[PDB]
Amino acid sequence: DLRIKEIKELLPPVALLEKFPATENAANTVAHARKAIHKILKGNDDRLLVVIGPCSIHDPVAAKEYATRLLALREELKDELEIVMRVYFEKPRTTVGWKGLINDPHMDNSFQINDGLRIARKLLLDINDSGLPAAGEFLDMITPQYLADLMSWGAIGARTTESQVHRELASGLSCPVGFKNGTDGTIKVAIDAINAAGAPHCFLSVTKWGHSAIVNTSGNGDCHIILRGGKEPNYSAKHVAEVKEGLNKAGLPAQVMIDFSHANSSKQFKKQMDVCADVCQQIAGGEKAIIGVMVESHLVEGNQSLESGEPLAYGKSITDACIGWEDTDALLRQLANAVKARRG
């Protein structure tokens, strides 16, 4: 072990669960959102799932201010939308970079992961206790045990949709999971992933006591695809139509979540408003297959760099660029209006 520089102690998940148990209302928020997404996935509800919020969490203060604003819109629009806040603690990097709040909460390569786990779970508890469900991307294999009970929906990243260990992880998650199409636009990897995840697996994992063990999962049937573009955007009716047939062809429900960001906006954050307009016209025109959308959204639009010394502006993303609150409130009302027109 000459490439392993140092080994440090890591709190077991039981300690984080004991320090920060779920309140009654937080468990109620998680259980009700999970069930509401299941019902949307089963076709038994015509509301739209909206996973929306910052590309990454770096500030518990801005996240909770964002959560309050979003929760007010969640209550107002709840006949049309099942609104779930992006509470992403883990970021996959193209090569190297800040991996998110849990890996480095102080954002300075001190890698205080025990503190990161504490900060993240407390935040998740606070947000669920307020009544707002949370979504996360499941990237690490060990962190889920610290946080999954407060997660109402999860995503597997486009760069890990093919990874067996991530499909194994999804097959044991207690929440619904969405799988992104390939970074080049390929639909087949995600379809395979949905099927892999619907099956039981047996593999090595870590328990809530921090020990490795042999686990057996039952398969997760609440899995679905996320369209995030490839070389070109793939949100348009022609692409929805192709995905639907590909899914049916493989014996899976013909339903999609559409990500407005990333490749579907050509990496231009304000173009998420142009995807909303085409998606809203599709829904308002009667497309039932669109069961969810994803939007990268913060208090203040744009982004900033930790590298730049310029002091960090408040409520502004340090990873990908996000739309700001004004566009977020207007975007959500557009989606609600389209769900309602689809219905009448």
Footprint of a copy of itself on 179-198 (CB under 8 A): 182-184, 186, 189, 192, 195-196
Q: Considering the rule CB under 8 A, would residue 92 count as an interface residue with a copy of itself?
A: yes
Q: Considering the rule CB under 8 A, would residue 26 count as an interface residue with a copy of itself?
A: no
Spatial distance between the Cα atoms of 198 and 247, rounded to a whole number of angstroms = 14
**Cβ-based nearer residue to a copy of itself, 171 or 264:** 171
- Contacting a copy of itself within 55-84 (CB under 8 A): none
Q: From the CB of 211, what's the least distance to a copy of itself, in Å?
A: 5
Q: Distance of CA 87 to CAs 161, 238, 318, Å?
A: 20, 31, 14
Reading the block at residue 131, the tokens are 């009544």
**Cβ-based nearer residue to a copy of itself, 217 or 272:** 217
**Cβ-based nearer residue to a copy of itself, 219 or 246:** 219
Q: From the CB of 52, what's the least distance to a copy of itself, in Å?
A: 24
Spatial distance between the Cα atoms of 24 and 313, rounded to a whole number of angstroms = 35
Q: Considering the rule CB under 8 A, would residue 44 count as an interface residue with a copy of itself?
A: no
Q: Considering the rule CB under 8 A, would residue 23 count as an interface residue with a copy of itself?
A: no
Residues 142-171 as x/- pattern, contact with a copy of itself by CB under 8 A: xx----xx---------xx-xxxxx----x
Q: From the CB of 68, what's the least distance to a copy of itself, in Å?
A: 27
Write out the H or E segment, with its range, that includes residue 128: helix 113-129
**Long-range Cβ contact pairs of 155-159 (< 8 A, separation 24 or more):** 155/51, 155/179, 155/180, 155/226, 155/294, 156/180, 156/193, 157/92, 158/182, 158/183, 158/228, 158/262, 159/92, 159/183
Q: Considering the rule CB under 8 A, would residue 251 count as an interface residue with a copy of itself?
A: no
Spatial distance between the Cα atoms of 92 and 159, rounded to a whole number of angstroms = 8
